[PDB]
Design a protein around this ligand. Structure first.
Ligand SMILES: [Mg+2]
Ligand SMILES: [Mg+2]
Ligand SMILES: [Mg+2]
Ligand SMILES: [Mg+2]
Ligand SMILES: [Mg+2]
Ligand SMILES: [Mg+2]
Ligand SMILES: [Mg+2]
Ligand SMILES: [Mg+2]
Ligand SMILES: [Mg+2]
Ligand SMILES: [Mg+2]
Ligand SMILES: [Mg+2]
Ligand SMILES: [Mg+2]
Ligand SMILES: [Mg+2]
Ligand SMILES: [Mg+2]
Ligand SMILES: [Mg+2]
Ligand SMILES: [Mg+2]
Ligand SMILES: [Mg+2]
Ligand SMILES: [Mg+2]
Ligand SMILES: [Mg+2]
Ligand SMILES: [Mg+2]
Ligand SMILES: [Mg+2]
Ligand SMILES: [Mg+2]
Ligand SMILES: [Mg+2]
Ligand SMILES: [Mg+2]
Ligand SMILES: [Mg+2]
Ligand SMILES: [Mg+2]
Ligand SMILES: [Mg+2]
Ligand SMILES: [Mg+2]
Ligand SMILES: [Mg+2]
Ligand SMILES: [Mg+2]
Ligand SMILES: [Mg+2]
Ligand SMILES: [Mg+2]
Ligand SMILES: [Mg+2]
Ligand SMILES: [Mg+2]
Ligand SMILES: [Mg+2]
Ligand SMILES: [Mg+2]
Ligand SMILES: [Mg+2]
Ligand SMILES: [Mg+2]
Ligand SMILES: [Mg+2]
Ligand SMILES: [Mg+2]
Ligand SMILES: [Mg+2]
Ligand SMILES: [Mg+2]
Ligand SMILES: [Mg+2]
Ligand SMILES: [Mg+2]
Ligand SMILES: [Mg+2]
Ligand SMILES: [Mg+2]
Ligand SMILES: [Mg+2]
Ligand SMILES: [Mg+2]
Ligand SMILES: [Mg+2]
Ligand SMILES: [Mg+2]
Ligand SMILES: [Mg+2]
Ligand SMILES: [Mg+2]
Ligand SMILES: [Mg+2]
Ligand SMILES: [Mg+2]
Ligand SMILES: [Mg+2]
Ligand SMILES: [Mg+2]
Ligand SMILES: [Mg+2]
Ligand SMILES: [Mg+2]
Ligand SMILES: [Mg+2]
Ligand SMILES: [Mg+2]
Ligand SMILES: [Mg+2]
Ligand SMILES: [Mg+2]
Ligand SMILES: [Mg+2]
Ligand SMILES: [Mg+2]
Ligand SMILES: [Mg+2]
Ligand SMILES: [Mg+2]
Ligand SMILES: [Mg+2]
Ligand SMILES: [Mg+2]
Ligand SMILES: [Mg+2]
Ligand SMILES: [Mg+2]
Ligand SMILES: [Mg+2]
Ligand SMILES: [Mg+2]
Ligand SMILES: [Mg+2]
Ligand SMILES: [Mg+2]
Ligand SMILES: [Mg+2]
Ligand SMILES: [Mg+2]
Ligand SMILES: [Mg+2]
Ligand SMILES: [Mg+2]
Ligand SMILES: [Mg+2]
Ligand SMILES: [Mg+2]
Ligand SMILES: [Mg+2]
Ligand SMILES: [Mg+2]
Ligand SMILES: [Mg+2]
Ligand SMILES: [Mg+2]
Ligand SMILES: [Mg+2]
Lengths: 154, 129, 205, 80, 122
RNA sequence: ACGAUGUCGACUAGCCGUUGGGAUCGAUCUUAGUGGCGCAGCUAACGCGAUAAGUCGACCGCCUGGGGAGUACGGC
RNA sequence: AGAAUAAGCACCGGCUAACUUCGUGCCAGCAGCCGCGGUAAUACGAAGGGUGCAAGCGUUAAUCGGAAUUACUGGGCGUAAAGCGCGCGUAGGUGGUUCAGCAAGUUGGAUGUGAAAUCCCCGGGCUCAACCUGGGAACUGCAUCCAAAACUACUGAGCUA
RNA sequence: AGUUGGUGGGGUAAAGGCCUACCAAGGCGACGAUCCGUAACUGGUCUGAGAGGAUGAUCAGUCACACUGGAACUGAGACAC
C-alpha cells in the first residue's frame, strides 16, 4: 500500500580522531488503510536520504492484520522491551485516542476507533515494536473457531 | 508444598504445551476432572483419562492444529491467597467472548456462557484463550 | 462579543474560500488570497499536528462567527448527545437562527443575517426572536416582519441566494418572504471537506 | 420472629453473667481479602450453667446492667 | 508487596511541602523592607541583582526580588510580595509586586505593562 | 557476614566432567551433592538457563531522586 | 433622532499557534523547565507584523490529573533504591486425597429501608441560554425471610502420593 | 477500685452503678486499650476512563455553643440566644 507517515527523525553521532561524525536516523510507517502495515528505520548523512531509506525498508515486510470493521476485535495488551501497550475497541463516534507512535501506526493501519494507552518507556521504536506485536496477534473469529463450528464459540 | 493443586494442573498443561509434548500426567482429583471435562467440551484438548488403583493418574492429550498450540494463554484467577468471587452481572470476559472463563457454581463447574444461561454466578477459577 | 475587522485576512490565513463577502464579484480579485496575512506572506512554513487541529477548529469557528466559550458549549452538548459527536457538532451549528436566515437567503453574509436577527426583523413562529443563537426546530416557519419586508437588502440578497447552489432542505415563498425549515441537513449535504475529526481530537485532550 | 446470635464462651468468672466471643468474616474494603473480626458480648446467664468453651446462642433484650443487654437462650455444645 | 502484607500495613501517600512556607496559603502578603541591597547570581550567569529583605505580618523574614529596570524602595517601605522563585539567586523564593502599595511600578514601559504595574500610555 | 540472588513445593531440549551409594548386563540405568557449555523462555543490557534470573503457587523481609544521613533527639 | 454611546489583555527560541528590524553589549535585564545577554540577540527594551482569548485578560495561592511516581485494578528487589549474617519458633496466613452431613462465606429470589435537593434520561415554562420545574432512572449499601450445594469454612469417618 | 458483676433499698416519665450499703475480684487491651496531636458529622462538592484522591463555602438533616465557670427554678417541653 501507499500511505506514508513519518514518526521520528533523530541525530546521532560517533567520535573519531578529529572530532564528531553526525548522522540522521528516521522512523516511518506505511500501509494501505485496510489491513496492511509495516515500519521501517533508516540511517544516512542527510535527512532526505534517511527518510527514503526508511520508506524503502518499511515498504517491505508488510503484514496483514485482521480488523473487525475499522475497529479491533477484543481488548489487547502487548509489550516490547520496557514498553507496555493497551488497546481496546471503541464506538464509531470515537476518534483515535492515542499519542505519538500509537497514532501514526493505527491511523495508517486503517482503524479509526482504538482508544489506546502506553505504560513504561515511550521510546518510539519500542512503542512501534510493541504495537505491531499486539496487532499481528489479532486472532479474529473463524480462526480461533477452528476447533469446532461457528456461532457456538461466541 | 502444593497448597494449590489446580494451579499445578494449569502450570503442567502450559509448560508441556510450550515444550511440544503430547500427553501430560498428574495426580487427579474430582475438581481437576471437572476442569478437564469442561476443557474437553470446549475443544481445547484432545482427550482426558482417569486411571484406577487407589492413586488415580489423570492424563491429557493436547492439540496443536497449526504450528502453534491451541491453548496460548491460560491463567488462574482465584488463588488460595485471594479467593475471588463474582456475581452474574460481573462475570469477566476474556478476549471479548472469544475465550472462556471457568466458573464454579452451585450447579457445578461450567463456562461463563452457561453461567449466564442458568443465571447463576460463583467462583471464577481460571481464564483460557 | 463579536469579531469586527478585516474579513479577507481570515480567508488568506485559512487558505480556503471561507465565505465572508457578499460574493458579488469574486474572491480572488480583492485580496490576492494565496499569501498568509502579514509581512511574511510568501513563506510556506509547514505546521505540526497541533497546528493542523487548531487551524481546522479556527476555520469552523470563523465561518459561523462563534466565539470560543459558546463553541465549548456546543461541543459539550454534542458530546452529551448520541450518534457521533463529530457530525452532531455540525448538526447543531447549522440550526442557529442567523445561519438559518442566511440559508433562506434574506442576508448577503452571515453578519448581515445576524444583524437582521438582532435588529428585530425576523419572527420564528410568528413572534419576534432577536437572539442569533435560537436553535430553530424542524418545521418552524421563519418569516420577516411586515414593516421591514421592503428593505433593499433582502431583495438584493434574494438573487444572490438564487445563484449559490440549492440547499434543498429549506423552502421559501418569495412574494411573502416566508420560508419553512424542513429539517437539519445531513452530513453529506454540507461541504465534505470540513474534517471534524480534527476538532474532536483537539478537544479530547 | 426474633433474631439471635451464636458464639463461644470465653469467660465465666462473673456472677450470673458470661462473656461470649462471636466471629465474623469481613471483606477488606480496598484489598478484597476476607479477614476475621471478633466481638465480645456480655450475656445474662441466670442459673450459672455455662463453662469456658461452651458453644451457646443468645438474644438481645433490654439492658440489665451497664454493658449487659443480651441473654442466652440455649446451650448447643458443651465443653469437653 | 503481598495482599496480606498490604492488609497489615497499607500503602501511604507522601505529602508535598509547599515551596513558599511564608504566606501560609495566601496569594500575597505585605511586609516591611528591613533593608534593600544587591547581590550576584550563580555560576553561569553574571549580573547585579536587586533584592529586598522583608519582614512579614506573619513575623517571618524572607528575601524578595524586585523586577523591572528601576525601583524606589528604601528602608521602612511597605510592600506586597507574591510567590515565585528566582533560579539564579540562592535563597530568594518570592517576588515583589510592582505598583501595589509603595513600589509605583516601572516607567517608560509599553509592552506587557501589566506585570509591572504601569498605566496605559493613552 | 556475597551466589551482592529469602524459605518451601511442582513442572520445562540436550552434551561433557566429578564426590558418596545403588541396581541390570568394562557398558547401561537411577539417586543425593559439586562444576563447565547450551535449545526454548526471560532480561535495559550484561547475562541466567533442572544448583533459573524460565512457567507457577504459599508465607515473610525490604524499596520509592541525590546529598544532609544510617546522622541528630528519644527508647533499649 | 442618529453610526451617533460602547476594546482591551497576554504571547511570538523549543515544549506551544504566531518574525523581522532598531537600541544595549556577561551591562541593563529575562526566566515554568531547558537556558538567553561578552558587536549583525527571531529569548533583554522598543517599533512594525502576527497568534490566542475577549468585557475580560494575565500573575500568585491551592486540589486532582497526567504520575503505572505507594502500582487492589496496576510496580519492583544479581549489577540502577531494595533479600534480615544464619537458624529455631509464638500469634497470624495458607492446606495432599475420598465419602457423608451443615449452610457461616458464596449464588439467586422476595420484602423493608436507602429524606428532599444535587448528578443522569425523557419532557414543560422564562423570546434563547443560564435558571426553574414534572416523571423516571440511580442511590453500586444495610437488614429479614426462601432456595441451591461446585468451591472455602465447620463436623464425623476414611486413605497413603 | 463505683472500677466489673450480684443482692436489698433509693431515685427517674422510663431500662441501667444512675445512687447507696453489703458480697465477690472482676472489666478493657497488638482485631491497638490508655496517652499525645488534630477535627463538628452527613447528604454532598471538585477531580479522575474507572478504582481511587482531596474536601465538608452556599442549600438540606443532625449535633454543640450563646462574655468565662457553676446551679437550679417555672414550664407539656429549657438547664434557657
Ligand atoms: Mg588509531
Ligand atoms: Mg552510522
Ligand atoms: Mg514492561
Ligand atoms: Mg519486564
Ligand atoms: Mg519512566
Ligand atoms: Mg461572555
Ligand atoms: Mg448507661
Ligand atoms: Mg510559581
Ligand atoms: Mg566466608
Ligand atoms: Mg545485603
Ligand atoms: Mg546495590
Ligand atoms: Mg536465608
Ligand atoms: Mg527459592
Ligand atoms: Mg526447614
Ligand atoms: Mg526450595
Ligand atoms: Mg523443591
Ligand atoms: Mg550456559
Ligand atoms: Mg532481571
Ligand atoms: Mg533489567
Ligand atoms: Mg501469588
Ligand atoms: Mg503468596
Ligand atoms: Mg509465592
Ligand atoms: Mg530523599
Ligand atoms: Mg530532597
Ligand atoms: Mg530529602
Ligand atoms: Mg548511630
Ligand atoms: Mg534535627
Ligand atoms: Mg541513641
Ligand atoms: Mg511554532
Ligand atoms: Mg517577555
Ligand atoms: Mg543588534
Ligand atoms: Mg519565550
Ligand atoms: Mg523581546
Ligand atoms: Mg499579568
Ligand atoms: Mg497558579
Ligand atoms: Mg499547589
Ligand atoms: Mg499550580
Ligand atoms: Mg496514582
Ligand atoms: Mg503535580
Ligand atoms: Mg496512567
Ligand atoms: Mg500489585
Ligand atoms: Mg519502578
Ligand atoms: Mg520476593
Ligand atoms: Mg553501587
Ligand atoms: Mg535474607
Ligand atoms: Mg542471604
Ligand atoms: Mg535471616
Ligand atoms: Mg525477626
Ligand atoms: Mg532472628
Ligand atoms: Mg549488615
Ligand atoms: Mg520456621
Ligand atoms: Mg499455626
Ligand atoms: Mg483441600
Ligand atoms: Mg486453618
Ligand atoms: Mg465434600
Ligand atoms: Mg444475598
Ligand atoms: Mg435521595
Ligand atoms: Mg424552552
Ligand atoms: Mg440442603
Ligand atoms: Mg461501694
Ligand atoms: Mg440486678
Ligand atoms: Mg432496684
Ligand atoms: Mg444495686
Ligand atoms: Mg492508639
Ligand atoms: Mg476545632
Ligand atoms: Mg489514573
Ligand atoms: Mg469520585
Ligand atoms: Mg465526574
Ligand atoms: Mg472530615
Ligand atoms: Mg455558613
Ligand atoms: Mg438543620
Ligand atoms: Mg439523627
Ligand atoms: Mg438541628
Ligand atoms: Mg440525634
Ligand atoms: Mg444544643
Ligand atoms: Mg453571642
Ligand atoms: Mg463577642
Ligand atoms: Mg453561663
Ligand atoms: Mg435557682
Ligand atoms: Mg429558686
Ligand atoms: Mg417540673
Ligand atoms: Mg440547650
Ligand atoms: Mg431562652
Ligand atoms: Mg445558655
Ligand atoms: Mg437553637
Amino acid at each position: 500500500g501507499y500511505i506514508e507517515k513519518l514518526v521520528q527523525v533523530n541525530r546521532v553521532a560517533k567520535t573519531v580522531k578529529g572530532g564528531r561524525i553526525f548522522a540522521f536516523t528516521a522512523l516511518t510507517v506505511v500501509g494501505d488503510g485496510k489491513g496492511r502495515v509495516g515500519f521501517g528505520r533508516g540511517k544516512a548523512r542527510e535527512v532526505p536520504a534517511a527518510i527514503q531509506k526508511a520508506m524503502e525498508a518499511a515498504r517491505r515486510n508488510m503484514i496483514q492484520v485482521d480488523l473487525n470493521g475499522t475497529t479491533l476485535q477484543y481488548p489487547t495488551k502487548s509489550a516490547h522491551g520496557a514498553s507496555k501497550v493497551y488497546m481496546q475497541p471503541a464506538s464509531e463516534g470515537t476518534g483515535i485516542i492515542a499519542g505519538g507512535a500509537m497514532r501514526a501506526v493505527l491511523e495508517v493501519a486503517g482503524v479509526q476507533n482504538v482508544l489506546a494507552k502506553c505504560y513504561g518507556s515511550t521510546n518510539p521504536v519500542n512503542v512501534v515494536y510493541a504495537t505491531f506485536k499486539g496487532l499481528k496477534n489479532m486472532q479474529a473469529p473463524e480462526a480461533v473457531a477452528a476447533k469446532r463450528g461457528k456461532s457456538v464459540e461466541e | 508444598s502444593m497448597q494449590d493443586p489446580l494451579a499445578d494442573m494449569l502450570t503442567r498443561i502450559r509448560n508441556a504445551q510450550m515444550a511440544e509434548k503430547t500427553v501430560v500426567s498428574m495426580p487427579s482429583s474430582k475438581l481437576k476432572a471437572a476442569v478437564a471435562k469442561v476443557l474437553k467440551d470446549e475443544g481445547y484438548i484432545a482427550d482426558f483419562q482417569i486411571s484406577s488403583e487407589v492413586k488415580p493418574q489423570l492424563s491429557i492429550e493436547l492439540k496443536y492444529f497449526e504450528g502453534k498450540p491451541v491453548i496460548e494463554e491460560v491463567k488462574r484467577i482465584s488463588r488460595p491467597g485471594l479467593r475471588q468471587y463474582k456475581s452474574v452481572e460481573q462475570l469477566p470476559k476474556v478476549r471479548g467472548g472469544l475465550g472462556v472463563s471457568i466458573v464454579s457454581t452451585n450447579k457445578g463447574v461450567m463456562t461463563d456462557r452457561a453461567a449466564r444461561a442458568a443465571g447463576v454466578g460463583g467462583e471464577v477459577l481460571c481464564t483460557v484463550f | 462579543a463579536r469579531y469586527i475587522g478585516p474579513k479577507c485576512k481570515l480567508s488568506r490565513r485559512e487558505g480556503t474560500d471561507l465565505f465572508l463577502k457578499s460574493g458579488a464579484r469574486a474572491l480572488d480579485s480583492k485580496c490576492k488570497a494565496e499569501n498568509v496575512p502579514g509581512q511574511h506572506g510568501q513563506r510556506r512554513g509547514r505546521l505540526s499536528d497541533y497546528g493542523l487541529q487548531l487551524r481546522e477548529k479556527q476555520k469552523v469557528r470563523r465561518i459561523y462567527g462563534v466565539l470560543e466559550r459558546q463553541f465549548r458549549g456546543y461541543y459539550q452538548e454534542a458530546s452529551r448527545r448520541k450518534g457521533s459527536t463529530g457530525e452532531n457538532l455540525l448538526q447543531l451549528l447549522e440550526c442557529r437562527l442567523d445561519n438559518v436566515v442566511y440559508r433562506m437567503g434574506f442576508g448577503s453574509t452571515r453578519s448581515e443575517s445576524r444583524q437582521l436577527v438582532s435588529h428585530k426583523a425576523i419572527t420564528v413562529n410568528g413572534q419576534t426572536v432577536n437572539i442569533p443563537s435560537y436553535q430553530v426546530k424542524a418545521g418552524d416557519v421563519v418569516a420577516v416582519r411586515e414593516k421591514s419586508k421592503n428593505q433593499l437588502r433582502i431583495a438584493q440578497a434574494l438573487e444572490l441566494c438564487g445563484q449559490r447552489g440549492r440547499v434543498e432542505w429549506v423552502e421559501v415563498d418569495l412574494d411573502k418572504k416566508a420560508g419553512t425549515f424542513k429539517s437539519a441537513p445531513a452530513r453529506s449535504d454540507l461541504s465534505a471537506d470540513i474534517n471534524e475529526n480534527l476538532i474532536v481530537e483537539l478537544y479530547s485532550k | 420472629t426474633v433474631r439471635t446470635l451464636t458464639g463461644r464462651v470465653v469467660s465465666d468468672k462473673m456472677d450470673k453473667t458470661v462473656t461470649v466471643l462471636i466471629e465474623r468474616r469481613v471483606k477488606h474494603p480496598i484489598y478484597g481479602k476476607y479477614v476475621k473480626r471478633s466481638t465480645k458480648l456480655h450475656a445474662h446467664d441466670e442459673s450459672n450453667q455455662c463453662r469456658i468453651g461452651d458453644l451457646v446462642t443468645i438474644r438481645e433484650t433490654r439492658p440489665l446492667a451497664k454493658t449487659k443487654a443480651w441473654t442466652l437462650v440455649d446451650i448447643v455444645e458443651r465443653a469437653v | 508487596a503481598t495482599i496480606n502484607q498490604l492488609v497489615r500495613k497499607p500503602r501511604k501517600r507522601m505529602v508535598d511541602k509547599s515551596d513558599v512556607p511564608a504566606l501560609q496559603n495566601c496569594p500575597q502578603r505585605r511586609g516591611v523592607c528591613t533593608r534593600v541591597y544587591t547581590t550576584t547570581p550563580k555560576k553561569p550567569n553574571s549580573a547585579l541583582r536587586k533584592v529586598c529583605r522583608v519582614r512579614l505580618t506573619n513575623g517571618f523574614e524572607v528575601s524578595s526580588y524586585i523586577g523591572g529596570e528601576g525601583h524606589n524602595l528604601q528602608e521602612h517601605s511597605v510592600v506586597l510580595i507574591r510567590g515565585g522563585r528566582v533560579k539564579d539567586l540562592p535563597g530568594v523564593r518570592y517576588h515583589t509586586v510592582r505598583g501595589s502599595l509603595d513600589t509605583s511600578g516601572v516607567k517608560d514601559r509599553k509592552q506587557g505593562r501589566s506585570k509591572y504595574g504601569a498605566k496605559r500610555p493613552k
